[PDB]
């Protein structure tokens, strides 16, 4: 369709081989059985194969394979480059750039001096850092300059959410605040909690908040009013999930509760953890809970039955990510585990000779890599598929004498790291690492 152009315009020398002599459509069919590594090699045999191995609908299919789903445009005997091939190649380069590309020194965004970064958001090109310094800061992931400082809270910030230009914050001052991320202006102060606002989860137009007062509150992000109050927990509420339909909450009362928010009704009390529930994941079908009991329970939301209780960690499960029934759990036992929550299999433990030396503070993952951060001052890249250590993405000099990495967000091309120390050996700051190509 678009390869006939190149044929009758870059007239290639006659070829005496098998695929140059097939009807174009049949050569394309044959070349469609190859993997990109081999299509990429074939393109280098001769001018005829190069033109044929750049068919758009050949690569639209390979990109759909690796979940690309979006072409790349870049506005001498010339060439009509495929956007789906540029899209595929670009991704493989970003991948190899994370895995083994030289680490260009990061942008350092200094702020929240001598305090803790307690929450991190990363949204397009904006970063939001929250702190016990009472403030939040909005940054540009591109320039590294501080754009705004969200001042108004009388106590320390301890949770946050970000949709798009709306920032939600939680503080020890018992209040949540709705913010405009461009203007820096606070547009609502949400009153109702009687204790510190510990967690929050935003789904579209509503944020659910958990407090040290043992309650949850559902709020309208636009009208700034408080729609519901979920009462039933007996100790502080530490984690919360909200999919638009149920609220799932975990607390220091050893319990996980499932709610219907509209009716304010507790549908299920999930019982089994023998210590505080500290982290939660919910995909509308399964709720996944991690506790100081060293266990991670997988529950069925619609019945409240416990499907799996996943054992093996030895300490608090600090963070978890759930995606397509793959669970990644980080722990204070200095260990990251990849679980298959369909079968309960523990697919991998990340514990090399290059294992973390302190607790895991944060993690992120995608189809290729797990990214982990720790008290040891490091952020490590791991191969999801093999469980193997790849490399240290960050290695604070102060890691062993006080320097810690509190939190990471990753995009497809950048890594953001919240870094600091309780003892002054690390000035507190964000690090931005760029893994893009051209």
């Amino acid at each position: 369709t678009q390869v006939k152009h190149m044929m009758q315009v870059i007239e290639p020398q006659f070829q005496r081989d098998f695929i140059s002599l097939l009807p174009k459509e049949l050569a394309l069919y044959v070349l469609s059985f190859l993997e990109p590594k081999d299509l990429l090699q074939a393109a280098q045999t001769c001018r005829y194969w190069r033109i044929l191995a750049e068919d758009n609908l050949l690569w639209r299919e390979k990109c759909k394979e690796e979940g690309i789903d979006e072409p790349l445009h870049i506005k001498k005997p010339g060439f009509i480059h495929s956007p789906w091939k540029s899209a595929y190649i670009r991704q493989h380069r970003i991948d190899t750039n994370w895995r083994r590309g030289e680490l260009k020194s990061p942008k350092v965004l200094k702020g929240h001096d001598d305090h803790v970064i307690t929450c991190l958001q990363f949204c397009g090109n904006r970063i939001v850092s929250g702190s016990d310094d009472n403030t939040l800061k909005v940054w540009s992931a591109v320039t590294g300059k501080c754009l705004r400082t969200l001042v108004g809270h009388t106590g320390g910030v301890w949770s946050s959410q970000m949709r798009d230009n709306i920032i939600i914050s939680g503080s020890t001052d018992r209040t949540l605040k709705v913010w405009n991320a461009e203007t820096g202006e606070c547009i609502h102060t949400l009153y109702g909690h009687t204790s510190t606002v510990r967690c929050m989860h935003l789904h579209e137009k509503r944020v659910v908040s958990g407090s040290r007062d043992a309650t949850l509150r559902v709020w309208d992000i636009e009208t700034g009013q408080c729609l519901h109050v979920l009462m039933g927990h007996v100790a502080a509420v530490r984690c919360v999930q909200y999919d638009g339909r149920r609220v799932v909450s975990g607390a220091y009362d050893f319990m996980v509760k499932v709610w219907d928010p509209e009716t304010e009704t507790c549908l299920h009390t999930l019982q089994g953890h023998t210590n505080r529930v500290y982290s939660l994941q919910f995909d509308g079908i399964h709720v996944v809970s991690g506790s100081l009991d060293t266990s991670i329970r997988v529950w069925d939301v619609e019945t409240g039955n416990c499907i799996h209780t996943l054992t093996g960690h030895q300490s608090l499960t600090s963070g978890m990510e759930l995606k397509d029934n793959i669970l990644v759990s980080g722990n204070a036992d200095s260990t990251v585990k990849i679980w298959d929550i369909k079968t309960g299999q523990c697919l991998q433990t990340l514990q090399g000779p290059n294992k973390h030396q302190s607790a895991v503070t944060c993690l992120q993952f995608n189809k290729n890599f797990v990214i982990t951060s720790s008290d040891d001052g490091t952020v490590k890249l791991w191969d999801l598929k093999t469980g193997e250590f790849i490399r240290n993405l960050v290695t604070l000099e102060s890691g062993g004498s006080g320097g810690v990495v509190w939190r990471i967000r990753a995009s497809n091309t950048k890594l953001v790291c919240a870094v600091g120390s309780r003892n002054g050996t690390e000035e507190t700051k964000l690090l931005v690492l760029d893994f893009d190509v051209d």
Binding site: D132, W158, T172, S315, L316, A332
Partner: peptide, 12 residues
């Protein structure tokens, strides 16, 4: 059991 190395707001 290396927890409480993770931050958490002070008590009131």
């Amino acid at each position: 059991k290396k927890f409480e190395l993770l931050p958490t707001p002070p008590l009131s």
